Amino acid sequence: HLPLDSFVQLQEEYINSKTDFLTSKNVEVERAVDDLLQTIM
Amino acid sequence: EKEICKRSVSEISWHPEGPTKVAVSYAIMRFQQMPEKMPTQAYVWDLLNPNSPEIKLMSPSAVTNISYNQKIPDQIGGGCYNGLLAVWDGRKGENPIMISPVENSHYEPVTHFHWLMSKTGSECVTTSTDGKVMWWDTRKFEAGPVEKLNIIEGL
Amino acid sequence: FFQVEVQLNGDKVTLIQKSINRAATAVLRCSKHLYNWDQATFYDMIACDKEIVKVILLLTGSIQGTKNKVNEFLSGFTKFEWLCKESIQESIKKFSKNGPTLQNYEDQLKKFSQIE
């Protein structure tokens, strides 16, 4: 987030929100890759 | 994920506001092929996190047909394999708030359930393979449904 | 833009690298939540990659550059304030150097009207 101790903590939670969005998108990509292998078999 | 046998997506419905969530039911329409004590529960997905379901709709029996109600934002109503009608709330979910009586509600499974949008407090209609169409009141499940029509052919 | 406050800490002109590093180390924790396919992290994968290690050097290098432009108008600030060095012990000695001369007292007071 582009727009001293307060600044940092606000940026860390903004990251902690984005991580929960990424974590989900990993397993979604796994399912996708694991489907490509299944479809072929 | 890790269910006893597979469960067929018996019916789907979209969220009335916009394409953000998709409520889906799960039951076997093959006769007696459903296992003894299979997991009877509908889920509701969000298009942001499609890994696992956003919220669970725990039911007494397997849910055959569900739909969203445009009148009351997030009030899903569903027809079970037993013949029972159920209604949940899409925010809190969990257990069903309105459930029909066992004896007066029709035999054999709800083949279709739709909301009667044209009404102040919403009403719902329901057909079956028993061949008895019914006009239910959501506020008042009371002593059975309001209207009973049996589907005669030919006169 | 990074806001700092100039002042005289212990009557010495002084005034971030830790706080911005805390902002960075969270960006590395982002990988640790990623979790390996297999079934295990990506933090080991990112620690290994050179380009990431190279960019951490350019961050600590970019703070020095900004500090030095701060040092200039800091060092510029100290010079006009250097005349009033710490302790009035100076003024007590200078009180006897002036001695009788009115114009000298007037002149020194005129200097302090200017510093004002």
GROMACS .gro file of C-alpha atoms in nm:
model
  312
    1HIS     CA    1   0.000   0.000   0.000
    2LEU     CA    2   0.165   0.329  -0.128
    3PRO     CA    3  -0.128   0.558  -0.026
    4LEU     CA    4   0.635   0.538   1.149
    5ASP     CA    5   0.522   0.244   1.375
    6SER     CA    6   0.154   0.310   1.270
    7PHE     CA    7   0.255   0.309   0.894
    8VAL     CA    8   0.428  -0.037   0.934
    9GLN     CA    9   0.141  -0.219   1.122
   10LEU     CA   10  -0.117  -0.093   0.860
   11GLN     CA   11   0.112  -0.231   0.579
   12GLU     CA   12   0.154  -0.575   0.756
   13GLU     CA   13  -0.228  -0.639   0.786
   14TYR     CA   14  -0.273  -0.521   0.419
   15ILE     CA   15  -0.014  -0.799   0.337
   16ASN     CA   16  -0.184  -1.053   0.577
   17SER     CA   17  -0.509  -0.994   0.373
   18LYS     CA   18  -0.328  -1.046   0.033
   19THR     CA   19  -0.163  -1.373   0.165
   20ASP     CA   20  -0.512  -1.527   0.236
   21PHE     CA   21  -0.600  -1.440  -0.132
   22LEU     CA   22  -0.272  -1.603  -0.261
   23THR     CA   23  -0.286  -1.917  -0.032
   24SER     CA   24  -0.631  -1.998  -0.185
   25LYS     CA   25  -0.504  -1.935  -0.545
   26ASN     CA   26  -0.218  -2.193  -0.494
   27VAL     CA   27  -0.453  -2.495  -0.427
   28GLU     CA   28  -0.685  -2.364  -0.711
   29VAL     CA   29  -0.378  -2.379  -0.946
   30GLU     CA   30  -0.289  -2.730  -0.805
   31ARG     CA   31  -0.644  -2.860  -0.887
   32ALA     CA   32  -0.596  -2.708  -1.240
   33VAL     CA   33  -0.256  -2.887  -1.290
   34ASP     CA   34  -0.394  -3.212  -1.132
   35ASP     CA   35  -0.697  -3.191  -1.375
   36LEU     CA   36  -0.461  -3.159  -1.684
   37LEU     CA   37  -0.297  -3.492  -1.574
   38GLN     CA   38  -0.642  -3.657  -1.503
   39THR     CA   39  -0.797  -3.540  -1.840
   40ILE     CA   40  -0.493  -3.701  -2.019
   41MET     CA   41  -0.516  -4.035  -1.821
   42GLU     CA   42  -1.393  -3.331  -0.078
   43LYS     CA   43  -1.383  -3.690   0.069
   44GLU     CA   44  -1.762  -3.769   0.061
   45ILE     CA   45  -1.913  -4.123   0.102
   46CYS     CA   46  -1.960  -4.211  -0.272
   47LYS     CA   47  -2.014  -3.922  -0.524
   48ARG     CA   48  -2.309  -3.673  -0.493
   49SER     CA   49  -2.475  -3.547  -0.820
   50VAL     CA   50  -2.529  -3.164  -0.849
   51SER     CA   51  -2.913  -3.202  -0.852
   52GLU     CA   52  -2.983  -2.822  -0.900
   53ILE     CA   53  -2.795  -2.483  -0.913
   54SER     CA   54  -2.912  -2.119  -0.846
   55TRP     CA   55  -2.740  -1.775  -0.887
   56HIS     CA   56  -2.733  -1.486  -0.630
   57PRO     CA   57  -3.005  -1.231  -0.729
   58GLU     CA   58  -2.799  -0.906  -0.672
   59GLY     CA   59  -2.525  -1.025  -0.917
   60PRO     CA   60  -2.285  -1.311  -1.010
   61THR     CA   61  -2.088  -1.318  -0.676
   62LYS     CA   62  -2.212  -1.648  -0.515
   63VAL     CA   63  -2.367  -1.974  -0.659
   64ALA     CA   64  -2.582  -2.190  -0.422
   65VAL     CA   65  -2.577  -2.562  -0.531
   66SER     CA   66  -2.765  -2.871  -0.394
   67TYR     CA   67  -2.635  -3.235  -0.376
   68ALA     CA   68  -2.846  -3.558  -0.389
   69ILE     CA   69  -2.877  -3.892  -0.580
   70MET     CA   70  -3.182  -3.908  -0.817
   71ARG     CA   71  -3.101  -4.281  -0.885
   72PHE     CA   72  -3.350  -4.488  -0.676
   73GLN     CA   73  -3.222  -4.668  -0.355
   74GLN     CA   74  -2.862  -4.626  -0.496
   75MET     CA   75  -2.796  -4.348  -0.235
   76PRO     CA   76  -2.590  -4.506   0.051
   77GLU     CA   77  -2.723  -4.554   0.411
   78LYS     CA   78  -2.643  -4.228   0.607
   79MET     CA   79  -2.472  -4.041   0.315
   80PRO     CA   80  -2.374  -3.674   0.383
   81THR     CA   81  -2.699  -3.470   0.327
   82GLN     CA   82  -2.593  -3.099   0.296
   83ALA     CA   83  -2.605  -2.820   0.029
   84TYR     CA   84  -2.307  -2.575  -0.007
   85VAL     CA   85  -2.275  -2.213  -0.141
   86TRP     CA   86  -1.959  -2.110  -0.341
   87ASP     CA   87  -1.796  -1.763  -0.391
   88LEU     CA   88  -1.616  -1.683  -0.724
   89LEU     CA   89  -1.316  -1.526  -0.530
   90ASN     CA   90  -1.217  -1.844  -0.328
   91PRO     CA   91  -1.335  -2.152  -0.530
   92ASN     CA   92  -1.106  -2.393  -0.328
   93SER     CA   93  -1.377  -2.491  -0.071
   94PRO     CA   94  -1.738  -2.370  -0.009
   95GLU     CA   95  -1.789  -2.023   0.156
   96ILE     CA   96  -2.080  -2.146   0.381
   97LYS     CA   97  -2.256  -2.481   0.467
   98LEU     CA   98  -2.639  -2.548   0.461
   99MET     CA   99  -2.699  -2.847   0.701
  100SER     CA  100  -3.040  -3.012   0.617
  101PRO     CA  101  -3.249  -3.301   0.767
  102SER     CA  102  -3.249  -3.497   0.431
  103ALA     CA  103  -3.059  -3.458   0.096
  104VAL     CA  104  -3.162  -3.131  -0.086
  105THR     CA  105  -3.297  -3.192  -0.444
  106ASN     CA  106  -3.382  -2.836  -0.573
  107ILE     CA  107  -3.274  -2.498  -0.416
  108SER     CA  108  -3.306  -2.131  -0.532
  109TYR     CA  109  -3.222  -1.777  -0.401
  110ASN     CA  110  -3.510  -1.531  -0.320
  111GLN     CA  111  -3.460  -1.185  -0.490
  112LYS     CA  112  -3.714  -1.029  -0.240
  113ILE     CA  113  -3.512  -1.117   0.080
  114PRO     CA  114  -3.135  -1.085   0.005
  115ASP     CA  115  -2.966  -1.423   0.097
  116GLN     CA  116  -3.267  -1.644   0.190
  117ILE     CA  117  -3.214  -1.985   0.013
  118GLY     CA  118  -3.513  -2.230   0.004
  119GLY     CA  119  -3.482  -2.602  -0.084
  120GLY     CA  120  -3.688  -2.921  -0.139
  121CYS     CA  121  -3.553  -3.244   0.024
  122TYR     CA  122  -3.563  -3.606  -0.113
  123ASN     CA  123  -3.803  -3.695   0.181
  124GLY     CA  124  -4.066  -3.445   0.051
  125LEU     CA  125  -3.978  -3.187   0.325
  126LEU     CA  126  -3.929  -2.815   0.233
  127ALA     CA  127  -3.645  -2.622   0.412
  128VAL     CA  128  -3.532  -2.251   0.421
  129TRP     CA  129  -3.185  -2.124   0.540
  130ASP     CA  130  -3.021  -1.774   0.558
  131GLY     CA  131  -2.717  -1.731   0.323
  132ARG     CA  132  -2.521  -1.512   0.576
  133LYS     CA  133  -2.531  -1.740   0.891
  134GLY     CA  134  -2.627  -2.070   0.713
  135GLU     CA  135  -2.581  -2.379   0.943
  136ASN     CA  136  -2.933  -2.523   1.027
  137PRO     CA  137  -3.270  -2.451   0.853
  138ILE     CA  138  -3.502  -2.185   1.014
  139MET     CA  139  -3.836  -2.299   0.848
  140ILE     CA  140  -3.917  -2.677   0.798
  141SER     CA  141  -4.257  -2.820   0.679
  142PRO     CA  142  -4.452  -3.088   0.876
  143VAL     CA  143  -4.363  -3.455   0.785
  144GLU     CA  144  -4.722  -3.594   0.753
  145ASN     CA  145  -4.902  -3.319   0.546
  146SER     CA  146  -4.602  -3.236   0.313
  147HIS     CA  147  -4.614  -3.454  -0.007
  148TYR     CA  148  -4.456  -3.805  -0.045
  149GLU     CA  149  -4.160  -3.864  -0.290
  150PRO     CA  150  -3.897  -3.598  -0.373
  151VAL     CA  151  -3.940  -3.222  -0.458
  152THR     CA  152  -3.867  -3.211  -0.837
  153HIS     CA  153  -3.884  -2.822  -0.849
  154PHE     CA  154  -3.892  -2.529  -0.594
  155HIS     CA  155  -3.932  -2.160  -0.710
  156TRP     CA  156  -4.011  -1.832  -0.520
  157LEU     CA  157  -4.328  -1.623  -0.596
  158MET     CA  158  -4.143  -1.284  -0.623
  159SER     CA  159  -4.482  -1.105  -0.680
  160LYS     CA  160  -4.580  -1.088  -0.305
  161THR     CA  161  -4.484  -0.861  -0.004
  162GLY     CA  162  -4.344  -1.133   0.229
  163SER     CA  163  -4.223  -1.407  -0.014
  164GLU     CA  164  -4.416  -1.733  -0.096
  165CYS     CA  165  -4.278  -2.056  -0.263
  166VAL     CA  166  -4.431  -2.323  -0.501
  167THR     CA  167  -4.329  -2.696  -0.516
  168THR     CA  168  -4.403  -2.997  -0.752
  169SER     CA  169  -4.322  -3.373  -0.704
  170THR     CA  170  -4.327  -3.721  -0.873
  171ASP     CA  171  -4.629  -3.788  -0.638
  172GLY     CA  172  -4.806  -3.550  -0.885
  173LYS     CA  173  -4.926  -3.285  -0.633
  174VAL     CA  174  -4.833  -2.916  -0.698
  175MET     CA  175  -4.836  -2.698  -0.377
  176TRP     CA  176  -4.828  -2.316  -0.305
  177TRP     CA  177  -4.641  -2.281   0.032
  178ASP     CA  178  -4.627  -1.969   0.262
  179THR     CA  179  -4.271  -1.901   0.400
  180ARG     CA  180  -4.387  -1.685   0.700
  181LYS     CA  181  -4.650  -1.955   0.788
  182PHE     CA  182  -4.553  -2.327   0.733
  183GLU     CA  183  -4.829  -2.386   0.998
  184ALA     CA  184  -5.052  -2.694   0.915
  185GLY     CA  185  -4.919  -2.794   0.567
  186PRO     CA  186  -4.940  -2.590   0.241
  187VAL     CA  187  -5.220  -2.346   0.133
  188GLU     CA  188  -5.313  -2.488  -0.214
  189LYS     CA  189  -5.331  -2.864  -0.311
  190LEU     CA  190  -5.366  -2.951  -0.687
  191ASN     CA  191  -5.326  -3.314  -0.816
  192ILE     CA  192  -5.215  -3.322  -1.187
  193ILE     CA  193  -5.502  -3.511  -1.366
  194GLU     CA  194  -5.454  -3.556  -1.749
  195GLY     CA  195  -5.740  -3.559  -2.009
  196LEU     CA  196  -6.047  -3.467  -1.790
  197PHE     CA  197   0.814   1.062   0.070
  198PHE     CA  198   0.972   0.990   0.417
  199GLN     CA  199   0.902   1.259   0.687
  200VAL     CA  200   1.172   1.301   0.965
  201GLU     CA  201   1.195   1.561   1.252
  202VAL     CA  202   1.520   1.767   1.302
  203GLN     CA  203   1.592   1.869   1.668
  204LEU     CA  204   1.879   1.898   1.927
  205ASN     CA  205   1.885   1.559   2.116
  206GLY     CA  206   2.109   1.616   2.425
  207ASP     CA  207   2.183   1.958   2.259
  208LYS     CA  208   2.337   1.773   1.953
  209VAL     CA  209   2.167   1.809   1.605
  210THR     CA  210   2.026   1.454   1.523
  211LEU     CA  211   1.703   1.274   1.399
  212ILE     CA  212   1.408   0.457   0.984
  213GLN     CA  213   1.615   0.164   0.832
  214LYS     CA  214   1.476  -0.071   1.110
  215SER     CA  215   1.107   0.031   1.052
  216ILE     CA  216   1.130  -0.014   0.666
  217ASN     CA  217   1.309  -0.354   0.720
  218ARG     CA  218   1.003  -0.467   0.931
  219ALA     CA  219   0.791  -0.370   0.622
  220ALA     CA  220   1.024  -0.585   0.401
  221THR     CA  221   1.045  -0.901   0.626
  222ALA     CA  222   0.658  -0.930   0.600
  223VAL     CA  223   0.698  -0.940   0.213
  224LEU     CA  224   0.921  -1.252   0.273
  225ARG     CA  225   0.659  -1.408   0.515
  226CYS     CA  226   0.415  -1.385   0.213
  227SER     CA  227   0.610  -1.679   0.053
  228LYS     CA  228   0.608  -1.891   0.379
  229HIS     CA  229   0.221  -1.909   0.357
  230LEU     CA  230   0.242  -2.020  -0.017
  231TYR     CA  231   0.300  -2.392   0.082
  232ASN     CA  232   0.470  -2.649  -0.155
  233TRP     CA  233   0.254  -2.856  -0.401
  234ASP     CA  234   0.403  -3.201  -0.295
  235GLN     CA  235   0.129  -3.272  -0.029
  236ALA     CA  236   0.728  -2.737   0.305
  237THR     CA  237   0.756  -2.364   0.201
  238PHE     CA  238   0.874  -2.114  -0.071
  239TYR     CA  239   1.071  -1.893   0.183
  240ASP     CA  240   1.376  -2.127   0.122
  241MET     CA  241   1.325  -2.082  -0.261
  242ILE     CA  242   1.322  -1.694  -0.229
  243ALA     CA  243   1.619  -1.676   0.021
  244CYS     CA  244   1.819  -1.878  -0.245
  245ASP     CA  245   1.733  -1.652  -0.549
  246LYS     CA  246   2.012  -1.390  -0.602
  247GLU     CA  247   1.790  -1.113  -0.762
  248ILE     CA  248   1.592  -1.091  -0.428
  249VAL     CA  249   1.921  -1.066  -0.222
  250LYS     CA  250   2.053  -0.800  -0.473
  251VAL     CA  251   1.734  -0.583  -0.431
  252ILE     CA  252   1.771  -0.587  -0.042
  253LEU     CA  253   2.121  -0.422  -0.090
  254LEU     CA  254   1.970  -0.144  -0.315
  255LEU     CA  255   1.707  -0.064  -0.041
  256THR     CA  256   1.973  -0.012   0.237
  257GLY     CA  257   2.174   0.175  -0.036
  258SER     CA  258   1.874   0.405  -0.123
  259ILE     CA  259   1.825   0.515   0.248
  260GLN     CA  260   2.192   0.642   0.270
  261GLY     CA  261   2.132   0.859  -0.045
  262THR     CA  262   1.817   1.025   0.105
  263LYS     CA  263   1.992   1.067   0.451
  264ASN     CA  264   2.286   1.255   0.280
  265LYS     CA  265   2.045   1.511   0.116
  266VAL     CA  266   1.891   1.543   0.471
  267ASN     CA  267   2.250   1.577   0.617
  268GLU     CA  268   2.314   1.875   0.377
  269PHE     CA  269   2.025   2.102   0.502
  270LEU     CA  270   2.089   1.952   0.853
  271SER     CA  271   2.466   2.042   0.831
  272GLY     CA  272   2.346   2.372   0.672
  273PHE     CA  273   2.114   2.416   0.977
  274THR     CA  274   2.387   2.348   1.242
  275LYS     CA  275   2.621   2.624   1.101
  276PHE     CA  276   2.392   2.931   1.171
  277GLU     CA  277   2.308   2.776   1.518
  278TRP     CA  278   2.682   2.697   1.592
  279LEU     CA  279   2.752   3.060   1.718
  280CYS     CA  280   2.522   2.986   2.020
  281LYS     CA  281   2.731   2.682   2.134
  282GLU     CA  282   2.603   2.496   2.449
  283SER     CA  283   2.660   2.672   2.791
  284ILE     CA  284   2.642   3.049   2.885
  285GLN     CA  285   2.995   3.002   3.043
  286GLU     CA  286   3.097   3.156   2.701
  287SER     CA  287   2.876   3.469   2.761
  288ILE     CA  288   3.017   3.512   3.121
  289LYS     CA  289   3.379   3.527   2.980
  290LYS     CA  290   3.260   3.748   2.684
  291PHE     CA  291   3.080   3.971   2.949
  292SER     CA  292   3.430   4.092   3.071
  293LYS     CA  293   3.581   4.126   2.714
  294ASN     CA  294   3.306   4.383   2.621
  295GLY     CA  295   3.380   4.564   2.954
  296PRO     CA  296   3.295   4.940   2.943
  297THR     CA  297   3.210   5.001   2.569
  298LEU     CA  298   2.831   5.079   2.529
  299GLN     CA  299   2.852   5.043   2.145
  300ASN     CA  300   3.004   4.691   2.210
  301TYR     CA  301   2.702   4.586   2.432
  302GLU     CA  302   2.465   4.750   2.172
  303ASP     CA  303   2.658   4.571   1.887
  304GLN     CA  304   2.637   4.224   2.057
  305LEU     CA  305   2.263   4.281   2.136
  306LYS     CA  306   2.221   4.399   1.768
  307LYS     CA  307   2.384   4.062   1.665
  308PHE     CA  308   2.116   3.880   1.877
  309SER     CA  309   1.836   4.092   1.714
  310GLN     CA  310   1.980   3.956   1.380
  311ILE     CA  311   2.000   3.591   1.513
  312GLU     CA  312   1.637   3.647   1.637
   0.00000   0.00000   0.00000
